[PDB]
Amino acid sequence: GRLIYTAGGYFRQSLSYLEAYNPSNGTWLRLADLQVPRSGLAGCVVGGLLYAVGGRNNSPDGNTDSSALDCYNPMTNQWSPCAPMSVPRNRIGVGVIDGHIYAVGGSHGCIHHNSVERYEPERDEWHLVAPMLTRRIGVGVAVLNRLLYAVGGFDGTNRLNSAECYYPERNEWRMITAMNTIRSGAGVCVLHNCIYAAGGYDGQDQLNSVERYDVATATWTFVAPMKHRRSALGITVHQGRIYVLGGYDGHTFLDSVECYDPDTDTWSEVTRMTSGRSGVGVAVT
Ligand SMILES: COc1ccc(S(=O)(=O)Nc2ccc(NS(=O)(=O)c3ccc(OC)cc3)c3ccccc23)cc1
């Protein structure tokens, strides 16, 4: 009975929605609003708890990048504040390894981070780990074989097709094979033994293409393209399928949710959010 949760986002301004989708019956739940509206945040789950990490509050008055970390408990329907990160990180990537949340890249104003920090929920503390090789914002992050992958993004000058691999036991990064397509703001997840990068922005157009990295062969391969081009999309995996939610298509903030089935290699539109939005954090619990 797991749900896909979607937190925050952007439509005219940063949003406070926490909504959940139930793929078994196609219904949506409206849950407790975020304390502070945020977009460009990342969502992850550790031990049944949903965490909303980083992002930005883009409001009528002004804009503030967020160093915040907040914890949503589905049992109690309440957000609680956690220890903040060392720096604000808008357009952040995040992965979880062994119960620890990794906050990768992102921006603070015009500073494009290569730093990486790790959150320990048992102790409510962030600690810096080794920095990435490249500054990356709008970076997609996936965890496979207890390694953390940082894919694409924007370094401050160049939009990137490069990707790198973090080794927690050695505390070191290495560059891996570059993608076929430059992508910032892509959706990045892991399904079966592969990293998928879906959509994003190549510096000219929003993309519908989708590629996957097979770790055995160290090669990126195109798979079936989404129906909508999209960047700043949310992404998750649920019962063996990839779900992509929202994003910006070049003209509209999308309410479309597409599902990818790897056995048929096809995308289908399975629901719509209650309103169109980009830059959401998404996770499953
Ligand atoms: C068009 O208006 C927008 C206003 C706000 C927003 S957002 O949803 O609040 N966040 C973001 C905005 C941009 C990002 N990088 S990008 O590569 O996708 C991109 C780059 C250039 C573009 O065109 C010139 C469009 C998208 C984001 C990346 C990750 C997460 C959030 C991003 C989205 C759209």
Summarize the structure in words.
This protein is an all-beta fold and 285 residues long. 0% of the residues lie in helices and 46% in strands. It has no helices and 30 strands. Strands 5-4-1-30 form a four-stranded antiparallel sheet, with no helix packed on it. Strands 6-7-10-11 form a four-stranded antiparallel sheet, with no helix packed on it. Strands 12-13-16-17 form a four-stranded antiparallel sheet, with no helix packed on it. Strand 4 and strand 5 form a beta hairpin. The protein is globular. The site of N,N'-naphthalene-1,4-diylbis(4-methoxybenzenesulfonamide) has 14 residues, from loops. The PDB classes it as transcription. The entry lists the keywords transcription. It forms a monomeric assembly.
List keywords for this structure.
four-stranded antiparallel beta sheet; binds N,N'-naphthalene-1,4-diylbis(4-methoxybenzenesulfonamide); Neuraminidase; 285 residues; monomer
In short:
It is classed as transcription. The chain has no helices and 30 strands.
Largest sheet: 4 strands, antiparallel
CATH class: Mainly Beta
Q: Cα-atom Rg, whole angstroms?
A: 17 Å
Number of domains: 1
| Net shape | globular
CATH A-level architecture = 6 Propeller
Topology order in helix (H) and strand (E) letters = EEEEEEEEEEEEEEEEEEEEEEEEEEEEEE
Number of helices: 0
Annotated CATH homologous superfamily: Kelch-type beta propeller
Any idea of the CATH topology?
Answer: Neuraminidase
Total E-strand runs: 30
N- and C-termini, Cα separation: 8 Å
**Which ions and ligands are bound to the chains?**
N,N'-naphthalene-1,4-diylbis(4-methoxybenzenesulfonamide)
Name the structural class.
mainly beta
Strand order of the largest sheet: 5-4-1-30
